[PDB]
């Protein structure tokens, strides 16, 4: 069921950080060169793959969704839903973290942090 | 192909199109027939309730008149949204802990009568949490029929901890009718119920300290408000302003032995695993029209603080748009291709029948 989201294909296969941005309801990869820079107007999903203490050859997961101070409701809500989807894609193993701009957890801060002005346009059609 | 989102409330239909930021059709979930022994639906029935008796096909979140509910759905599709339902995958909503026949029959009518190509039934409180941009928290949803508490962890409702109370907006309207009648007025009929519902929405509030407010109301007229009835008479409302929603915290005001909404929230959190309770207390999300009373968030903050451990961090989130949070959460989810992948198709219904809703939804 999560198999119908192309963005998850190949995710979480090695230790590291993978990042997607919500863009008009779609999950769009963020190129590695930009990891750590977040548009204040947008919402993101950050998958941290690491080796657990219990076995240095296995993989565990923290999944953070990051909500910019000016992100719109469609973007934050998509980021939440798709975080659950990615968690399910990885068998429920990821631990979820909600990160709000300026309130990021110690865990999130430890992955890197630059905040960029603006962001992509909302996916909502505004009803007048 | 655009999906429809229809949040059938006990009091109001909220319907519209996936990807819109608000429902384009919002109207009373009512059917009106001549008060003197044809039928009218929605705003038009409300417009001339002067010669109609009004009936709600949904009571306490449950469809109790399936013939009239079909009329409501037909009106939503053909007269309000003006769409052909056979062309639109449709997202519906439901309060938790309903009798299983309700969503079975919703599924049957949608496919057999309206011939929708696909549909899905989502729990209302869960849609509201996602609309708030959260996967963990506890939702208090209170509309016209049901108050429900749903704790949600990593995106999934925790059904063992859900609390439900068949006390919500319509019971508060009825109680205002009663206590206003005790002030010398007379509000009894179904049309007069709609007048008092408007008084409630415009003038009621939740007192931070009920006993103190009751004493303030007796000491002077400072809390009184005036209201113009449809016939021109102007009435005055006093402590009824806050006695009416006090019922949410003291259900014995209408003879109910149930816990109030602060206690049901606390009880719901306490049914959850200890290690997630701090995140639930810090993420109490309110949704629905009966959470719109001025003062309710502050009162909930105070009452939960008194129930919780003394150091517990408690936060009430009260989105200004929370009369539409369920709908908006649905509009977001129905805009995602992978969510629609999970919907029941007409073919699956043809082969499996109404039981299909339990396999694909709940
Ligand atoms: C909006 C709803 C669904 C999309 C599910 C959603 C989790 C989810 C998120 C993304 C992709 C798949 C699943 N969160 C829930 O509580 C649901 C989810 O439903 C399913 C099928 O996943 C939860 C199911 C249970 C068993 O935990 C329930 O609480 C059940 C009784 C009620 C159903 C709840 C579902 C809700 O209506
Ligand atoms: N400002 C308000 N104060 C108090 N109650 C309100 C307010 N606005 C709406 N309501 C009540 O909320 C209920 C409708 O809210 P809604 O969430 O649409 O319910 P439902 O989903 O059951 O139709 C009605 O009881 C209505 O009177
Ligand atoms: Ca944006
Ligand atoms: Ca998980
Ligand atoms: Mg509702």
Curated annotation (Swiss-Prot), chain B:
InterPro entries attached to this UniProt entry: Actin, Actin/actin-like_CS, Actin_CS, ATPase_NBD
Function as written in the Swiss-Prot or TrEMBL entry: Actins are highly conserved proteins that are involved in various types of cell motility and are ubiquitously expressed in all eukaryotic cells.
EC number(s) given by UniProt: 3.6.4.-
Modified positions (N6-methyllysine) in chain numbering: 71
PROSITE patterns with a match to the protein in the record: ACTINS_1 (PS00406), ACTINS_2 (PS00432), ACTINS_ACT_LIKE (PS01132)
PTM section of the record: MICAL1 and MICAL2 produce the (R)-S-oxide form. The (R)-S-oxide form is reverted by MSRB1 and MSRB2, which promotes actin repolymerization.
Residues bearing the modification Tele-methylhistidine: 60
Location relative to the cell: Cytoplasm, Cytoskeleton
Subunit details: Polymerization of globular actin (G-actin) leads to a structural filament (F-actin) in the form of a two-stranded helix. Each actin can bind to 4 others.
Protein name stated in the entry: Actin, alpha skeletal muscle
GO cellular component: actin cytoskeleton; actin filament; stress fiber; striated muscle thin filament
CDD domains linked to this entry: ASKHA_NBD_actin (cd10224)
An example Gene Ontology molecular-function term: ATP binding
Domain of life: Eukaryota
Annotated source species: Gallus gallus
Further facts: In vertebrates 3 main groups of actin isoforms, alpha, beta and gamma have been identified. The alpha actins are found in muscle tissues and are a major constituent of the contractile apparatus. The beta and gamma actins coexist in most cell types as components of the cytoskeleton and as mediators of internal cell motility.
GO biological process: skeletal muscle fiber development; skeletal muscle thin filament assembly
Reactions the enzyme catalyzes: ATP + H2O = ADP + phosphate + H(+)
Family under the similarity heading: Belongs to the actin family.
Highest classification ranks of the organism: Eukaryota, Metazoa, Chordata, Craniata, Vertebrata
């Amino acid at each position: 069921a999560s198999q119908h989201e192309d963005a998850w294909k190949g995710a979480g296969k090695q230790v590291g950080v993978e990042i997607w941005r919500i863009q008009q309801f779609k999950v769009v990869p963020v190129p590695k060169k930009h990891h750590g820079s977040f548009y204040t107007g947008d919402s993101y999903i950050v998958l941290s793959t690491y080796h657990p203490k219990t076995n240095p050859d296995k993989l565990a997961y923290d999944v953070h969704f990051w909500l910019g101070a000016f992100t719109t409701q469609d973007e934050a809500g998509t980021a939440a839903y798709k975080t659950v989807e990615l968690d399910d894609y990885l068998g429920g193993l990821p631990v979820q973290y909600r990160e709000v701009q300026g309130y990021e957890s110690e865990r999130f801060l430890s992955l890197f942090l630059r905040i960029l002005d603006g962001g992509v346009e909302t996916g909502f059609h505004h009803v007048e | 192909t655009t999906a429809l989102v229809c949040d059938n409330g006990s009091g109001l239909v909220k319907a519209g199109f996936a990807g819109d930021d608000a429902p384009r059709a919002v109207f009373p979930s009512i059917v009106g027939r001549p008060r003197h022994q044809d039928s009218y639906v929605g705003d038009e029935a409300q417009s001339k309730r002067g010669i109609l008796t009004l009936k709600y096909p949904i009571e306490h979140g449950i469809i109790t008149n399936w013939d009239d509910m079909e009329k409501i759905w037909h009106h939503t599709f053909y007269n309000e949204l003006r769409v052909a339902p056979e062309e639109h995958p449709t997202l519906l909503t439901e309060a938790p802990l309903n009798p299983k026949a309700n969503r079975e029959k919703m599924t049957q009518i949608m496919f057999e009568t309206f011939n929708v190509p696909a549909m899905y039934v989502a729990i209302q409180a869960v849609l509201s949490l996602y609309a708030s941009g959260r996967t963990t928290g506890i939702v208090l949803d209170s509309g016209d029929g049901v108050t429900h508490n749903v704790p949600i962890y990593e995106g999934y409702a925790l059904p063992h901890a859900i609390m439900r109370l068949d006390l919500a907006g319509r019971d508060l309207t009825d109680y205002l009718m009663k206590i206003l009648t005790e002030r010398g007025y007379s509000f009894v009929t179904t049309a007069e119920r709609e007048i008092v519902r408007d008084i409630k929405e415009k003038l009621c509030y939740v007192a931070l300290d009920f006993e103190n407010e009751m004493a303030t109301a007796a000491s002077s007229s400072s809390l009184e408000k005036s209201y113009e009835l449809p016939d021109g008479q102007v009435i005055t409302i006093g402590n009824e302003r806050f006695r009416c929603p006090e019922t949410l915290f003291q259900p014995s005001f209408i003879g109910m032995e149930s816990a109030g909404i602060h206690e049901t929230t606390y009880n719901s959190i306490m049914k959850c695993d200890i290690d997630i309770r701090k995140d639930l207390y810090a993420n109490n999300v309110m949704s629905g029209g009966t959470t719109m009373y001025p003062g309710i968030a502050d009162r909930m903050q105070k009452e939960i603080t008194a129930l919780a451990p003394s150091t517990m961090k408690i936060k009430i989130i009260a989105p200004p748009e929370r009369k539409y949070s369920v709908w908006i959460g649905g509009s977001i989810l129905a805009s995602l291709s992978t969510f629609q992948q999970m919907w029941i198709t007409k073919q699956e219904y043809d082969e499996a029948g109404p039981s299909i809703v339990h396999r694909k939804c709940f």
